Amino acid sequence: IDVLLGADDGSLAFVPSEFSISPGEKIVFKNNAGFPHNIVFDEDSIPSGVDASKISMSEEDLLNAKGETFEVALSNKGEYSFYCSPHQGAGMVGKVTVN
Ligand SMILES: [Cu+2]
């Protein structure tokens, strides 16, 4: 599943922001507009035994160019909340459910 980092109208959002995937299904986060951006999984809002470092960029890590991507596949079932560090307050957050 392809997820845009910034909307086509320049909005600071993940498109789509809420979605469900199956275990092993690739998520490709792609820089679109308003970059730099990153994708950080909230360590307190992912399956409790999951290592957020295995699936997340650090808050300092950034995707700098249009078209640059961050790819990750989630294994463990459950809800995973994530956000873009620099734009969290602006509302650039999402939630993916692995079922
Ligand atoms: Cu962002």
Curated annotation (Swiss-Prot):
Q: Does the keyword DNA damage apply?
A: no
User: Any idea where this protein resides?
Assistant: Plastid, Chloroplast thylakoid membrane
- Specify the superkingdom: Eukaryota
Entry's Gene Ontology molecular function annotations: copper ion binding; electron transporter, transferring electrons from cytochrome b6/f complex of photosystem II activity
Q: Which residues bind Cu cation?
A: 37, 84, 87, 92
Q: State a GO cellular component annotated for this protein.
A: chloroplast thylakoid membrane
Q: How the protein sits in the membrane? A: Peripheral membrane protein
Instruction: Report the principal subcellular site.
Output: plastid
What UniProt keywords are attached to this protein's entry?
A: Chloroplast, Copper, Electron transport, Membrane, Metal-binding, Plastid, Thylakoid, Transit peptide, Transport
Q: How is the cofactor bound?
A: The crystal structure with reduced Cu(1+) has also been determined.
Instruction: Report the residue ranges that make up the Plastocyanin-like domain in this protein.
Output: 1-99
Cofactor(s) for this protein?
Cu(2+)
Summarize the protein's role.
Participates in electron transfer between P700 and the cytochrome b6-f complex in photosystem I.
The UniProt similarity line reads: Belongs to the plastocyanin family.
Q: What is this protein called?
A: Plastocyanin A, chloroplastic
- Organism field: Populus nigra
Tell which residues of the whole protein are contained here. 70 to 168 of 168
